[PDB]
């Protein structure tokens, strides 16, 4: 079963190479989607892939992040089953 879920990560999450590490971890886990800095100092995006792989990523986003990050909170929402992927890679949105 494939799912899509949205995320936003709060904390010391900008200026700590969060997007680069997020993309690398997503790719390692066989996930597609995207990551983007927000105007409110957070990191946001969407993950898509097998449920099991998405859960691994969610733990990473709430627990680990990039080496220099400090994560205050990870909010997940809009989880939904999808019939096929909407993306073919894990992109950093400039």
Numbering used by the authors: 5 to 98
Study text:
Here we used a pair of thermophilic/mesophilic acylphosphatases homologues (acylphosphatase from hyperthermophilic archaeon Pyrococcus horikoshii (PhAcP) and human common-type acylphosphatase (HuAcP)) as a model to study how local flexibility of the active site affects the enzymatic activity. Despite remarkable conservation of sequence and structure at the active site, the catalytic activity of the thermophilic PhAcP is significantly poorer as compared with its mesophilic homologue HuAcP at low temperatures. The salt-bridge between the active-site residue Arg-20 and the C-terminal carboxyl group is found only in thermophilic PhAcP but not in mesophilic HuAcP. Taken together, our data suggest that the presence of the salt-bridge between the C-terminal carboxyl group and the active-site arginine residue increases the activation energy that results in a stronger temperature dependency of the enzymatic activity.
Importantly, the activation energy (52.5±2.5 kJmol−1) for HuG99 was analogous to that for PhWT (49.1±1.4 kJmol−1), while the activation energy for HuA99 (29.5±1.9 kJmol−1) and HuWT (37.6±3.1 kJmol−1) was comparable to that for PhG91A (32.1±1.7 kJmol−1).
